[PDB]
Design a protein around this ligand. Structure first.
Ligand SMILES: [Cl-]
Ligand SMILES: [Cl-]
Ligand SMILES: [Cl-]
Ligand SMILES: [Cl-]
Ligand SMILES: [Cl-]
Ligand SMILES: [Cl-]
Ligand SMILES: [Cl-]
Ligand SMILES: [Cl-]
Ligand SMILES: [Cl-]
Ligand SMILES: [Cl-]
Ligand SMILES: [Cl-]
Ligand SMILES: [Cl-]
Ligand SMILES: [Cl-]
Ligand SMILES: [Cl-]
Ligand SMILES: [Cl-]
Ligand SMILES: [Cl-]
Ligand SMILES: [Cl-]
Ligand SMILES: [Cl-]
Ligand SMILES: [Cl-]
Ligand SMILES: [K+]
Ligand SMILES: [K+]
Ligand SMILES: [Mg+2]
Ligand SMILES: [Mg+2]
Ligand SMILES: [Mg+2]
Ligand SMILES: [Mg+2]
Lengths: 200, 196, 216, 202, 234, 239, 4, 233, 213, 248, 4
């Protein structure tokens, strides 16, 4: 797995590869690793697949109840904290989850990294998964807050692509999303084989 | 891996902490804050195991704030330090121990400024200065060499800068930036970050 | 049971036209010691169902106690419903699985034989809750020694008569006496038909030792 | 430890050695391993001293209360059952190899083995304990159907004497008891009274 | 009076008024009929509509493939008991891989429903059931009561004006064992129809039917699905 | 009001709630038990409250162990619950002590369970009396009877329900010590017919069970053909 | 089982 | 004085019958089910001009496809509403589908007779809920309206009024309703009826209206959208 | 160390068509180097529209399928309709995760029709990770089956081939070939192939002989 | 059982809690007990009911209890109830000290107990405690303090107050004679005896009949002392010498 | 420990 997200002037970009493995066996090349928590909040999945799916689906359940009880959108900070407090009770029991909670709320674009170790931190950019080191390299060298939208889509897509190249455990397709002020959109799904054609 | 430092002068406490959140071989955040405001004149600086550090600090924080609300006045630094200890020590042989190390800095109208050191075992010690993390190994002897009890705050910021420079020179970790704050009669002040 | 103590070896079973036969020796071994040489490892459950058990004998005696009491409980009602062999097999699967899932298994592998509504029933349950049905079964060393002979016959001729099934079982019990160091030449045969459950024994096989003089 | 019990027509004979060990130190050279559970029901104890004493005290309590409730002497099969239930249920926490033997008016003289693991089986005669390994052959060759009481006592003392000779973990005195309708007769074979078999010198 | 508020208080005539009062809950429910032949057990029920625009209360419930029930009394108590019955049926299939026998299920109801009749601050179940089932012993119609007693029936009716339906059923019961399914339902419907004020008729809006038998899992017919059974009451 | 709780004595030292439960039994139709040379026989006058009920509904005779029969009068749901308690006591007895529960012991155990419901405001007494019968070669024939107070005694002959006294005076005429079960069934059937008030309540089923030498110590329903012969004998004896 |  | 689970001689639980009498003290609410959706209308019952009207909430969203109108002791309704919300979200979590209107109503109704004073937890429900509810929504069976009262009885209704003036309002509903009625007609009808039965002059502040349609999610009417509908009335 | 698991073998396969689903499995039940039985299929009927394939530890296969059966009746009782294929898959995910810290050692593949009448396959890991697929192999010989399916059904690594819709006949010929090829090499896979075909008409059953060695 | 439940924790039809009211009647009949705040200290003066000739005199007081290093209380009402409450007061004070390593502030101790008392009025079906308390103490937040609590769970801060027999009369006398911000411990002692001399109108006032405790500060440490009978006799002497002046 |  490689996943990344970053905040910029025009919202937050979220991208992922699509590979799943059982050891060295490639189990799938078609996994959706970006989860739609609600129309203005995405969650990303790296680690144990069942662990991520289950806990993020439970996050979504909880965010919706919240919205029904309070008559307003849950904040990115509060949603990420619901997830942190859920998983904390299970530390050292073998959950493996590395997630980014991405949204837009009253404080503007929002991005938290949250994991099964207990970390919950806010930041401008993150990459998570076996391939993250490869994605940080290209992402870091191309990132800027004042990226134009299409440049930001190209950076995210290339950073994941390059991770798929070096890291045995990333691949399939790069799936790219954009959290804007009026909700997220699904921007593209490009197979890595088709991207290789293009970048040379 | 995390660095905390505190220096207590005659009428203030100066504190600083690194701003890195690390995971494996990468820094994931370079503007991390490791300080928690308990009250108007109390900071709790907390490092240790992921999850435990925030969960512990915030629980203390909310309980100290609750005390203010129930009673109309704040806990003293000493009382907050002993409250923090009681919790850590009570949890130590429980199902839910917290692997955290702390400094508590504060100013009390009557006792003056105070710095407190606490390890994960919950030993509590008052000190004129102190540090946590591997970086403490390189910097405590620098504090022993130059600290005096009368040290002014201009000079304490200089002493702090020598310690942080020593980490740039000699420590194997990349800790490029630090939060600096000071507490006195008029509360908690943010000083400029010390950066390299 | 974490550590078995007195244990029993193979149980064999085979279907025939109109019934089921099962066989088991009468020995409780304590490690390699042949300690209790006259114990039954077969249980009449009810009129249509019998049970044979490998593994820890004390755990078998507990299952006998529990299962015997269940059949009495049911007979008390006098309502015209009885546990079928299949239902007893299901119950046993659940009990074994359940004990496995608490990390405290009953240390047995079992063969349920039965006859009800014109159909022969033969089913296997182990200590992990692995369970299935088949025309012949053999637990323990019988899986390696007896089952190959059983299945070879059953392929050439799926439908055996009662005396054909009886002779085949005696042949298998001979082989086991020859090759399983925890076996014993004193066994029971139990048969279920329309007429109920008969347990015969003690029985012995003839043995040949001519090969003792074929070394030079 | 070596323990043994034999059925005859009208009663039982029980026997044990008298050795209690920790490692290879002898903590008691004159142990009494034949414990009364009721007026005419004994257990012979092998394995953990603490376990078999605690279990025997508990069954004695259970059976005594049962017997007052029914207002009849207890069945030997009922004593054996209570031992079995406790030894089976707590098999993972106990180290106990038990022989229950006695007399009741319903079934006469009976011997039950409850070995480790907590199975129960009735037997013509039973042997248990570490030392019993060394006498399987002997008792298999000597046992006769229809032995008198005196013959059962002789058979028992012989078998235990042989085991005691070879098993480091058995030894001391032989304690015997005979149980019949008329009551319980206990005795000790010690020193020269213990049956002797020559060491086979050249 | 002092003897009628607590289910734990015996009266001086050896009665428990709280139980008797619970039984009134079923007497005031709408009528339902249960009857059987050699091969099938049928339930037939009148559904009371609160207003003209209300649907009509469900009176027949699936328990298992081989068992369904008709209710009269407090609906909430009907569901609690129906759920209990569903669970006992699932447990029996889980453990034994075969249907819970109907007489055994009924015994469990009796045992369960008796418990609160003997404990202070508890109350009887305010519901009576007609139970249709098929098992190794053939078709069954049972009846259960707030008193925890139960009855094995050739046919039965409970609820308001059910005495009329009981009388019809007695009149024709000798015919039932030999009836085909259509005849048997016809009989159930005729009995139910006796409970109605002379103005009123059976319609597709107010009749519910439940059928189980040798060749047929418990099935519920409502609204347009009852039309075939009503046509040819000729 | 001194009669609302089984935890309240009246000033004369009575427990009226238990007395009121007994009245439920004495309102019920009659059940009888007779111990004889070689077993125990039970009979029940089983009133038929509808022709719509099946022949065999509302049994008042139960198997509580393979060797023990139970015969009840009173509130039927209470009695069935007591049958379950008895069954469980016999079951647990066998699991703990490894043999069939002796009747006297089973009777004493269930009786203390009945007794426990005669002390407290928290629960009411059972509205039922029951007989327990068994046979074995070692213990012989035995017949016990328990009432709502929890008192248990052994009997040669016994009756419970509304015609209790009338039944007893007919039972007293039998020399039951010298009679077999095959003879006593006919006499049980006879007595039930004598004490039946055929004017007051119309139609009844005769329910019969036994446990003796002839059943090999198993409690069983009397066979249909034998029951019908006993019915006919009782019917024609009434003339 | 599977990882991402 | 008697226990909360005492039956009356007529075979009813006193507490449930008394709880049904508390429903008559609540404001009138109306539910109508058409082929194009269901509408829910409720009298707010403003007691003072100092009270903020939007802070009265007697129609609530259960899930995107289900609304609920309530009448009676409103405080009692909160735990029922929360249970409906939690149940639909659990159903979504487990089965990845919308829960039916019937199924939600059923779940809520199973809370109904769960009161008593010596079976249960250290302090569970002491009395029934003094509340009636109309669940209106859309599922694969189409648009749907269900009624539930403190007995735990629930039932589908083509139209239904609850509260103080419900006899009255129900009469007018049998008059105006037909199966082939449109949603916009059902909206007008229920305001016409609320206008009749309210003590106060009906306006856009002292009522609430909400709809659920096959196409569209649960929708609370705005001040402006209420004023538009009020013009013809 | 008593081990509560044991591997009993079995290979499963599901294919989604435009108007059909296939679920296929071999019939061999193994333990160690032995065969328990040659006639133990791994397909289980759930509804008229849904079939599930299960392999791995047989003790868990039995227990889990009995749980699923009970949960389908409970669902039907609460909601008055049969569970959809998609709902069953979503539920199974939660059942598997309930044992996250003591898993069902089972590999599950669901094959059935969805609400539009179209073929649907859902595949699972032992703790309930799942997704929808066009086709999927699972269990003992999955690494042998999957690549050929990727190639022949997914048209992967192929140039200049029309991506036509998968006919039932071709889907069927594929299912038989991959199992026959697996039977050559995987020691656990053999005896017989059992194929369930789910259509709007219902569920029918073919069976093909495999090598007995 | 509903028949036997007296229902101690339910409202009456006027919004009242009868057991609380009835407890307050018990307290009104108990020994009079007054507390007086001063600039340099605080005092409790209470009527002794243990006055029979043959009593032994074994404890240092009858109705004055030390709670911790900086606080004491006195009680009026059911003695046994007062023992339960004062034992609980000590426990609360030590729980606080364990946790914060500083003494519990006076008002926080009172509040903590009052929440227990309140609970007995709202749930549990028990009779409330039949006790009112006067608490005296010092802390670093508000210095010298005097509190009053009663069975309802209510409390207040007072400069001077009174509970028990003839309270209303006592509080009237204090209202007139008490000088806000101008009292010393010596003038508050004089006033205490003046009030007790009027409010023990059955009959003549004695040292054996009262208990006085003072709470002062000496060298950063709180001193709590029960006056000896020699001192109490000398204060009564001075009050009777003062009433000789009162005309000329 | 101590055995027999
Ligand atoms: Cl994808
Ligand atoms: Cl929330
Ligand atoms: Cl952060
Ligand atoms: Cl990863
Ligand atoms: Cl043996
Ligand atoms: Cl047997
Ligand atoms: Cl010993
Ligand atoms: Cl032994
Ligand atoms: Cl042993
Ligand atoms: Cl030993
Ligand atoms: Cl020795
Ligand atoms: Cl009804
Ligand atoms: Cl109702
Ligand atoms: Cl009844
Ligand atoms: Cl009725
Ligand atoms: Cl009587
Ligand atoms: Cl209403
Ligand atoms: Cl102190
Ligand atoms: Cl203190
Ligand atoms: K020796
Ligand atoms: K193969
Ligand atoms: Mg790669
Ligand atoms: Mg931890
Ligand atoms: Mg031990
Ligand atoms: Mg091979």
């Amino acid at each position: 797995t490689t996943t990344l997200a970053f905040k910029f002037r025009h919202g937050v970009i979220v991208a992922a590869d699509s590979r799943a493995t059982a050891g060295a066996y490639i189990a799938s090349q078609t996994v959706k690793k970006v989860i739609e928590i609600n129309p203005y909040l995405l969650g990303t999945m790296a680690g144990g697949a069942a662990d991520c799916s289950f806990w993020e689906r439970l996050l979504a359940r909880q965010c919706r109840i919240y919205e029904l009880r309070n008559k307003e959108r849950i904040s990115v900070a509060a949603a990420s904290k619901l997830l942190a407090n859920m998983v904390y009770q299970y530390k050292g029991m073998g959950l493996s989850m590395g997630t980014m909670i991405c949204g837009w709320d009253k404080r503007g674009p929002g991005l938290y990294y949250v994991d099964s170790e207990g970390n919950r931190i806010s930041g401008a950019t993150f990459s998570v998964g076996s391939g993250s080191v490869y994605a940080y390299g290209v992402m870091d060298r191309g990132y800027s807050y004042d990226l134009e939208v299409e440049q930001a889509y190209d950076l995210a897509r290339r950073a994941i692509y390059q991770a798929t190249y070096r890291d045995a455990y990333s691949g399939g397709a790069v799936n790219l999303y954009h959290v804007r002020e009026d909700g997220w959109i699904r921007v593209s799904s490009d197979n890595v084989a088709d991207l290789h054609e293009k970048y040379s | 891996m995390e660095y905390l430092i505190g220096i207590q002068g005659p009428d203030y406490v100066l504190v600083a902490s690194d701003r890195v959140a690390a995971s494996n071989i990468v820094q994931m955040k370079d503007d991390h804050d490791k300080m928690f405001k308990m009250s108007e004149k109390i900071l709790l600086l907390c490092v240790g195991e992921a999850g435990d550090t925030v969960q512990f600090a915030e629980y203390i924080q909310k309980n100290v704030q609750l005390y203010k609300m129930r009673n109309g006045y704040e806990l003293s630094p000493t009382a907050a330090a002993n409250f923090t200890r009681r919790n850590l020590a009570d949890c130590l042989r429980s199902r839910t121990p917290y692997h955290v190390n702390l400094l508590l800095a504060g100013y009390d109208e009557h006792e003056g400024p105070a710095l407190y050191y606490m390890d994960y075992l919950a030993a509590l010690a008052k000190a004129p200065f102190a540090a946590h993390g591997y970086g403490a190994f390189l910097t405590l002897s620098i504090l022993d060499r130059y600290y005096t009890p009368t040290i002014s705050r201009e000079r304490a910021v200089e002493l702090l800068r020598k310690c942080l420079e020593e980490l740039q020179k000699r420590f194997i970790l990349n800790l490029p930036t630090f939060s600096v704050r000071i507490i006195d009669k008029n509360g908690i002040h943010d000083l400029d970050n010390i950066s390299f | 049971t974490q550590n078995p103590m007195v244990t029993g070896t193979s149980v064999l079973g085979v279907k025939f036209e109109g019934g089921v036969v099962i066989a088991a020796d009468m020995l409780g071994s304590y490690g390699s010691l042949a300690r209790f040489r006259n114990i039954s490892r077969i249980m009449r459950v009810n009129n249509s169902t019998m049970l044979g058990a490998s593994g820890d004998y004390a755990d078998f005696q507990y299952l006998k106690q529990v299962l015997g009491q269940m059949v009495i409980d049911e007979e008390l009602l006098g309502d015209g419903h009885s546990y079928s062999p299949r239902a007893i097999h299901s119950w046993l699967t659940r009990a074994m699985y359940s004990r496995r899932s608490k990390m405290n298994p009953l240390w047995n592998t079992m063969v349920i034989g039965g006859y009800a509504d014109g159909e022969s029933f033969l089913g296997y349950v182990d200590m992990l809750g692995v369970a299935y049905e088949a025309p012949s079964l053999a637990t323990g060393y019988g899986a390696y020694l007896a089952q190959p002979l059983l299945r070879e016959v059953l392929e050439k001729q799926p439908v055996l008569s009662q005396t054909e099934a009886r002779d085949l079982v005696e042949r298998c019990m001979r082989v086991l006496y020859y090759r399983d160091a925890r076996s014993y030449n004193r066994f029971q045969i139990a048969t279920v038909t329309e007429k109920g459950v008969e347990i015969e024994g003690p029985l012995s096989t003839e043995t040949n030792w001519d090969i003792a003089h074929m070394i030079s | 430890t070596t323990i043994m019990a034999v059925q005859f027509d009208g009663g039982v004979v029980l026997g044990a050695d008298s050795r209690t060990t920790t490692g290879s130190y002898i903590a008691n050279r004159v142990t009494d391993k034949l414990t009364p559970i009721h007026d005419r029901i004994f257990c012979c104890r092998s394995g953990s001293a603490a376990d078999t004493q605690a279990v025997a005290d508990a069954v004695t309590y259970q059976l005594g209360f049962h017997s007052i409730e029914l207002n009849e002497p207890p069945l030997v099969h009922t004593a054996a059952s209570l031992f079995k239930e406790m030894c089976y249920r707590y098999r993972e926490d106990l180290m106990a190899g038990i022989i229950i033997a006695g007399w009741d008016p319903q079934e006469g003289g009976q011997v039950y083995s409850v070995p480790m693991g907590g199975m129960m089986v009735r037997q013509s005669f039973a042997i248990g304990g570490s030392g019993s390994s060394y006498i399987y052959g002997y008792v298999d060759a000597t046992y006769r159907e229809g032995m008198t009481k005196e013959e059962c006592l002789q058979f028992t003392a012989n078998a235990l004497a042989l085991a005691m000779e070879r098993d480091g973990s058995s030894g001391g005195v032989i304690r015997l008891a005979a149980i019949a309708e008329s009551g319980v007769e206990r005795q000790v074979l010690l020193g020269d009274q213990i049956p002797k078999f020559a060491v086979a010198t050249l | 009076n002092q003897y009628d508020n607590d289910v734990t208080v015996w009266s001086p005539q050896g009665r428990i008024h709280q139980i008797e009062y619970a039984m009134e809950a079923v007497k005031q429910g709408s009528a339902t009929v249960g009857l059987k032949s050699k091969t099938h057990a049928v339930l037939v029920a009148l559904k009371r509509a609160q207003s003209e625009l209300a649907a009509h209360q469900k009176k027949i419930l699936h328990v298992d493939n081989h068992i369904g029930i008709s209710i009269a009394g407090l609906t909430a108590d009907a569901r609690l008991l129906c759920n209990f019955m569903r669970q006992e049926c699932l447990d029996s299939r889980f453990v034994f891989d075969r249907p819970l026998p109907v007489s055994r299920l009924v015994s469990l109801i009796g045992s369960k429903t008796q418990i609160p009749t003997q404990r202070y601050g508890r109350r009887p179940y305010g519901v009576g059931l007609l139970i249709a089932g098929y098992d190794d012993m053939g078709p069954h119609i049972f009846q259960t009561c707030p008193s925890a007693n139960y009855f094995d029936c050739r046919a039965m009716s409970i609820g308001a004006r059910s005495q009329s339906a009981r009388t019809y059923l007695e009149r024709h019961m000798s015919e039932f064992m030999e009836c085909n399914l259509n005849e048997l339902v016809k009989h159930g419907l005729r009995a139910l129809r006796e409970t109605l004020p002379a103005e009123q008729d059976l319609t597709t809006k107010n009749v519910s039917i439940g059928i189980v038998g040798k060749d047929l899992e418990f099935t519920i017919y409502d609204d347009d699905d009852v039309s075939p059974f009503l046509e040819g009451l000729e | 009001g001194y009669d609302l709780s089984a935890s309240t004595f009246s000033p004369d030292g009575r427990v009226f709630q238990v007395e009121y439960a007994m009245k439920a039994v004495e309102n019920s139709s009659t059940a009888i038990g007779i111990r004889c040379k070689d077993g125990v026989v039970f009979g029940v006058e089983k009133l038929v409250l509808s022709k719509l009920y099946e022949e065999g509904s509302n049994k008042r005779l139960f198997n509580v162990d393979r060797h023990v029969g139970m015969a009840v009068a009173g509130l039927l749901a209470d009695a069935r619950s007591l049958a379950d308690i008895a069954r469980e006591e016999a079951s647990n007895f066998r699991s703990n002590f490894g043999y069939n529960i002796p009747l006297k012991h089973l009777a004493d155990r269930v009786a203390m369970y009945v007794h426990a419901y005669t002390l407290y405001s928290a629960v009411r007494p059972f509205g039922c009396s029951f007989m327990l019968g068994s046979y074995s070669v070692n213990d012989g024939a035995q017949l016990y009877m328990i009432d709502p107070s929890g008192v248990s005694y052994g009997y040669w002959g016994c009756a419970i329900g509304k015609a209790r006294q009338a039944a007893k005076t007919e039972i007293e005429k039998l020399q039951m010590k010298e009679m077999t079960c095959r003879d006593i069934v006919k006499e049980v059937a006879k007595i039930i017919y004598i004490v039946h008030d055929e004017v007051k309540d119309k139609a009844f089923e005769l329910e019969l069970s036994w446990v003796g030498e002839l059943t090999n110590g198993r409690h069983e329903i009397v066979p249909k053909d034998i029951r019908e012969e006993a019915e006919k004998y009782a019917k024609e004896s009434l003339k | 089982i599977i990882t991402x | 004085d008697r226990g909360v689970n005492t039956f009356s001689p007529e075979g009813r639980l006193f507490q449930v019958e008394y709880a049904i009498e508390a429903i008559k003290l609540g404001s009138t609410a109306i539910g109508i089910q058409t082929s194009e959706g269901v509408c829910l209308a409720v009298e707010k019952r403003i007691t003072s001009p100092l009270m903020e009207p939007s802070s009265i909430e007697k129609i609530v969203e259960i899930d995107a496809h289900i609304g609920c109108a309530m009448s009676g002791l409103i405080a009692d309704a909160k735990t029922l509403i929360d249970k409906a919300r939690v149940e639909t979200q659990n159903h979504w979590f487990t089965y990845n589908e919308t829960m039916t209107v019937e199924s939600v109503t059923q779940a809520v109704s199973n809370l109904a007779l769960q009161f008593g004073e010596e079976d249960a937890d250290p302090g569970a429900m002491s009395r029934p809920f003094g509340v009636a509810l109309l669940f209106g929504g859309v599922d694969e069976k189409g648009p749907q309206l269900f009624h539930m009262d403190p007995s735990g009885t629930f039932v589908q209704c083509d139209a239904r009024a609850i509260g103080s003036a419900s006899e009255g309002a129900q009469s007018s509903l049998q008059e105006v309703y037909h199966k082939s009625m449109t949603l916009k007609e059902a909206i007008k009808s229920s305001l016409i009826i609320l206008k009749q039965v309210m003590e106060e002059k009906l306006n856009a502040t002292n009522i609430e209206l909400a709809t659920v349609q096959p196409g569209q999610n649960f929708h609370m009417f705005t001040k402006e959208e209420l004023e538009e509908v009020i013009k013809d009335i | 160390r008593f081990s509560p698991y044991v591997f009993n073998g079995g290979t499963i396969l599901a294919i989604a068509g435009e108007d059909f689903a296939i679920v296929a499995s071999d019939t061999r039940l193994s333990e160690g180097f032995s065969i328990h039985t040659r006639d133990s299929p791994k397909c289980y009927k759930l509804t008229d529209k849904t079939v599930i394939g299960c392999s791995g530890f047989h003790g868990d296969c039995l227990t889990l399928t009995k749980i699923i059966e009970a949960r389908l009746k409970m669902y039907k009782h609460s909601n008055n309709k049969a569970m959809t294929t998609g709902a069953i898959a979503a539920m199974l995910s939660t059942i598997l995760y309930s044992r996250r810290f003591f898993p069902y050692y089972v590999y599950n593949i669901i094959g059935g029709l969805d609400e539009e009448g179209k073929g649907a396959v859902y595949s699972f890991d032992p703790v309930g990770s799942y997704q929808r697929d066009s086709f999927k192999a699972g269990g003992s010989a999955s690494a042998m089956l999957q690549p050929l399916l990727d190639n022949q059904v997914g048209f992967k690594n192929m140039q200049n081939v029309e991506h036509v819709p998968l006919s039932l006949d071709r889907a069927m010929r594929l299912v038989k070939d991959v199992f026959i090829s697996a039977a050559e090499r995987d020691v656990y896979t053999g005896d017989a192939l059992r194929i369930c075909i789910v259509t709007k008409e219902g569920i029918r059953e073919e069976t093909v002989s495999l090598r007995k060695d | 059982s509903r028949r036997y439940d007296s229902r101690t924790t339910i409202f009456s039809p006027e919004g009242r809690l009868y057991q609380v009211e009835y407890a307050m009647e018990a307290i009104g009949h108990a020994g009079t007990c007054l507390g007086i705040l001063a600039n340099d200290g605080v005092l409790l003066a209470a009527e002794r009911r243990n006055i029979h000739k043959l009593l032994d005199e074994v404890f240092f007081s009858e109705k004055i209890y030390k709670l911790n290093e900086d606080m004491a209380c006195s009680v009026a009402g059911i003695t046994s109830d007062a023992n339960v409450l004062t034992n609980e007061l000590r426990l609360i004070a030590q729980r606080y000290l364990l946790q914060y390593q500083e003494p519990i502030p006076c008002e926080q101790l009172v509040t903590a107990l009052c929440d227990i008392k309140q609970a007995y009025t709202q749930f549990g079906g028990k009779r409330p405690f039949g006790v009112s308390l006067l608490y005296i103490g010092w802390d670093k937040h508000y210095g010298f303090q005097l509190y009053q609590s009663d069975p309802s769970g209510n409390y207040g801060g007072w400069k001077a107050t009174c509970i028990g027999n003839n309270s209303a009369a006592a509080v009237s006398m204090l209202k007139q004679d008490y000088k806000e911000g101008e009292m010393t411990l010596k003038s508050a002692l004089a006033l205490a005896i003046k009030v007790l001399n009027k409010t023990m109108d059955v009959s003549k006032l004695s040292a054996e009949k009262v208990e006085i405790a003072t709470l002062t500060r000496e060298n950063g440490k709180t001193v709590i002392r029960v006056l000896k009978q020699k001192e109490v006799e000398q204060l009564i002497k001075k009050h009777e010498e003062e009433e000789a002046k009162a005309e000329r």
